[PDB]
Amino acid sequence: MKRIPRKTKGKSSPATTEPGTSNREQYKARPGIASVQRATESAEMPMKNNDEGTPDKKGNTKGD
RNA sequence: AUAUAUAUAUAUAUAUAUAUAUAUAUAUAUAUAUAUAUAUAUAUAUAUAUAUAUAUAUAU
């Protein structure tokens, strides 16, 4: 058995040295990885919800 | 009173020296241009701190 936590509030509550593994990192990306990752993080986000106008569980529409 | 010779002064010519203007060479200062270096400001990236917003927790 394993447990997964909820993100919402619910209703009820030998020479093994291989001859190729040596690291020689001489390469810098163009564009750099760090820069592009930051940019993708922003477009990655889903667009915001628009609750206004809709009713609530009580029955009254929310908004101003 | 006259002539020749001699001395001083004025004028002219030749030689030597000085000052001003002009020309050539050398040096310095200012300006412009180029190059290098430094500093400052602006922009980009990384790290730290502060503030604000969202999520979570605590308090009212």
**3-state secondary structure labels for all residues of A20-61:** CCCCCCCCCCCCCHHHHHHHHHHHHCCCCCCCCCCECCCCCE
Dist CA A61 CA A30 (whole Å): 51
The technique is: cryo-EM
User: Which nucleotide lies closest to A37 by the C1' atom and the CA atom?
Assistant: B45
Dist CA A54 CA A47 (whole Å): 18
CA of A31 to C1' of B36 (A): 33
Q: Which nucleotides of B are covered by protein (CB under 7 A)?
A: 45-46, 56
SS3 content of chain A, % helix, strand, coil (to 5): 20, 5, 80
Burial A6-30 (b: 16+ CB within 10 A, else e): eeeeeeeeeeeeeeeeeeeeeeeee
Q: What is the resolution of this structure in A?
A: 3.3
Cβ of A38 near strand B (under 7 Å)? The reply is yes
CA of A39 to C1' of B12 (A): 106
Q: Residue A31: which region, alpha, beta or left (left: phi > 0; alpha: psi -120 to 50)?
A: beta
